[PDB]
Design an enzyme around this catalytic site. Structure first.
Site, PDB file in Angstrom:
ATOM      1  CG  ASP A   8       3.814   3.589  -0.860  1.00  0.00           C
ATOM      2  OD1 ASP A   8       4.857   3.306  -0.204  1.00  0.00           O
ATOM      3  OD2 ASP A   8       2.662   3.229  -0.537  1.00  0.00           O
TER       4      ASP A   8
ATOM      5  N   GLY B  34      -5.802  -0.875   5.488  1.00  0.00           N
ATOM      6  CA  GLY B  34      -4.610  -0.036   5.397  1.00  0.00           C
ATOM      7  C   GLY B  34      -4.791   1.393   5.861  1.00  0.00           C
ATOM      8  NE  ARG B  35      -0.556   7.581   5.457  1.00  0.00           N
ATOM      9  CZ  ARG B  35       0.361   7.848   6.382  1.00  0.00           C
ATOM     10  NH1 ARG B  35       1.025   6.862   6.975  1.00  0.00           N
ATOM     11  NH2 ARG B  35       0.622   9.103   6.720  1.00  0.00           N
TER      12      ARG B  35
ATOM     13  CD  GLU C 108     -12.478  -2.865   6.083  1.00  0.00           C
ATOM     14  OE1 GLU C 108     -13.016  -1.829   6.536  1.00  0.00           O
ATOM     15  OE2 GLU C 108     -12.709  -4.006   6.537  1.00  0.00           O
ATOM     16  CB  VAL C 109      -8.542  -4.165  -0.034  1.00  0.00           C
ATOM     17  CG1 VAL C 109      -8.763  -4.868  -1.361  1.00  0.00           C
ATOM     18  CG2 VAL C 109      -7.674  -2.905  -0.252  1.00  0.00           C
TER      19      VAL C 109
HETATM   20  N1  LIG Z   1      -2.673  -9.624   2.221  1.00  0.00           N
HETATM   21  C1  LIG Z   1      -3.273  -8.899   1.180  1.00  0.00           C
HETATM   22  C2  LIG Z   1      -2.708  -8.903  -0.090  1.00  0.00           C
HETATM   23  C3  LIG Z   1      -3.311  -8.196  -1.112  1.00  0.00           C
HETATM   24  C4  LIG Z   1      -4.474  -7.475  -0.890  1.00  0.00           C
HETATM   25  N2  LIG Z   1      -5.076  -6.740  -1.927  1.00  0.00           N
HETATM   26  C5  LIG Z   1      -5.495  -7.304  -3.107  1.00  0.00           C
HETATM   27  N3  LIG Z   1      -5.533  -8.621  -3.265  1.00  0.00           N
HETATM   28  C6  LIG Z   1      -5.933  -9.152  -4.397  1.00  0.00           C
HETATM   29  N4  LIG Z   1      -6.337  -8.445  -5.427  1.00  0.00           N
HETATM   30  C7  LIG Z   1      -6.335  -7.125  -5.375  1.00  0.00           C
HETATM   31  C8  LIG Z   1      -5.916  -6.504  -4.181  1.00  0.00           C
HETATM   32  C9  LIG Z   1      -5.926  -5.039  -4.126  1.00  0.00           C
HETATM   33  O1  LIG Z   1      -5.554  -4.445  -3.143  1.00  0.00           O
HETATM   34  C10 LIG Z   1      -6.400  -4.339  -5.255  1.00  0.00           C
HETATM   35  C11 LIG Z   1      -6.803  -5.016  -6.342  1.00  0.00           C
HETATM   36  N5  LIG Z   1      -6.750  -6.363  -6.425  1.00  0.00           N
HETATM   37  C12 LIG Z   1      -5.029  -7.469   0.381  1.00  0.00           C
HETATM   38  C13 LIG Z   1      -4.438  -8.179   1.408  1.00  0.00           C
END
Ligand SMILES: Nc1ccc(Nc2ncnc3c2C(=O)CC=N3)cc1
Length: 303
Positions: A135, A16-17, A20-21
């Protein structure tokens, strides 16, 4: 630190902005790890600050574990570790599935319950300040295994000091996702010194998310395809000007199908949407009022 050194990153799930997750494993359990570079320290620190707010924890707010740092021997990563939710975002969930009347109520009531807790000031020694999200959108809400939501992506939030009626980071500019921006944010009439104005702008965005959920409610096999609010009026990644012309000047809102009057749960949902969408923020429902209405509906449906 001691937590990051014991976590193994398994998969990058989003870029994202800011940050990174990743899906990681900690002490044998899945966790989410949001990773920021050294040059994004301000964004990392501010999100760690919001997630550490006293008394923040709630079943409908993403559960925060810890902030940490990890040095791979070349560069440092700044980490935010939180609970992992396999379904991902409400946006992903609504694209993949249709929901029952029970399913819709569960997603809407849990979202409103999470927003009512963020918005709530708790006075006392271990008091909680009121917080506005700034947001709120379906991509910033996660869906748990039990079919209830939790509000996530709190990094842009603002906190209120009720004694002085001031905001912790004294916002002076528009932030957030343009498609979900309230009319007063789009036309810059909002008073950014007035915390209650940010709560009211979150309610407008929640009304848009309710519309996304209600389209996916399947009754007798009848439902609408997934769409973002304003899909019929603006391009993908719309500008402030594009949104303002639709929301402020032409005064349009997402369409409410007349057939939503044919079902009691959809009728209650459509009425909430309209009462979140008023151009005047002061006329909008509060999150606590929406939680009360949907709780009454959930009790009636036997969820
Ligand atoms: N498509 C897509 C959808 C969602 C995400 N993010 C996440 N997904 C699962 N658990 C989470 C998160 C977070 O961001 C933060 C915490 N727990 C990433 C990508």
């Amino acid at each position: 630190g001691t937590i990051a050194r014991t976590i193994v990153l398994q998969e990058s799930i989003g870029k994202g902005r800011f940050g990174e997750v990743w899906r990681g494993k900690w002490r044998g359990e899945e966790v989410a790890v949001k990773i920021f570079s050294s040059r994004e320290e301000r964004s990392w620190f501010r999100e760690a600050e919001i997630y550490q707010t006293v008394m923040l924890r709630h079943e409908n707010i993403l559960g925060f574990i810890a902030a940490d740092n990890k040095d791979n021997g070349t560069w440092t990563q700044l980490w935010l570790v939180s609970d992992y939710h396999e379904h991902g975002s409400l946006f992903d969930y609504l694209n993949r599935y249709t929901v029952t009347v029970e399913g819709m109520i569960k997603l809407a009531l849990s979202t409103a319950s999470g927003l009512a807790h963020l918005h709530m000031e708790i006075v006392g020694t271990q008091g909680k300040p009121a917080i506005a999200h700034r947001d709120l959108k379906s991509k910033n809400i996660l869906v748990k295994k039990n079919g209830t939501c939790c509000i996530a992506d709190l990094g842009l939030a603002v906190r209120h000091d009720s004694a002085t009626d001031t905001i912790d980071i004294a916002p002076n500019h528009r932030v957030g996702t343009k498609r979900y921006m309230a009319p007063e944010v789009l036309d810059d009439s909002i008073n950014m010194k007035h915390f209650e104005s940010f709560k009211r702008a979150d309610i407008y965005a929640m009304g848009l998310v309710f519309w996304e959920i209600a389209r996916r409610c399947s009754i007798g096999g009848i439902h609408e395809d997934y769409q973002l609010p304003y899909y019929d009026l603006v391009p993908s990644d719309p500008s402030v000007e594009e949104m303002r012309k639709v929301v402020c000047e032409q005064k349009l809102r997402p369409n409410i199908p007349n057939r939503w009057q044919s079902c009691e749960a959809l009728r209650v949902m459509a009425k909430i949407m309209r009462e979140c969408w008023y151009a005047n923020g002061a006329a909008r429902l509060t999150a606590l009022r929406i939680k009360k209405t949907l709780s009454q509906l959930s009790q009636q449906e036997g969820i």
